[PDB]
Amino acid sequence: GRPYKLLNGIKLGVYIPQEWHDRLMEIAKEKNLTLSDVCRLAIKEYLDNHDKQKK
Amino acid sequence: GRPYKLLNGIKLGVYIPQEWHDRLMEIAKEKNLTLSDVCRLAIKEYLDNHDKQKK
């Protein structure tokens, strides 16, 4: 079931500075999220911010 | 040299829908980047639009 399309989860390997992982995860504890979630949330607002059409 | 800390590179795996893989990676062709880069870069964007300490 759901072999393709409706999986909506593909893997990307990111590498960021120590101080980046550090502060992001700190805020992530406040939000009960992981930095991975925040990164995902980042491009989400990145799209909405850099494009107002949102197709 | 640079045993720890000063390697400044931690490994984080993010998981996002193929919807974003379609749009973002196509832009990633034009920009010659990976979505991993874009997600990270969007965090710096996410920070700057919310917080103006720019830390």
UniProtKB/TrEMBL annotation, chains A, B:
Keywords: Plasmid. One of its GO terms (biological process) is regulation of DNA-templated transcription. InterPro entries: Arc_rbn_hlx_hlx, Ribbon_hlx_hlx. The keyword Cell membrane does not apply. This is CopG domain protein DNA-binding domain protein.
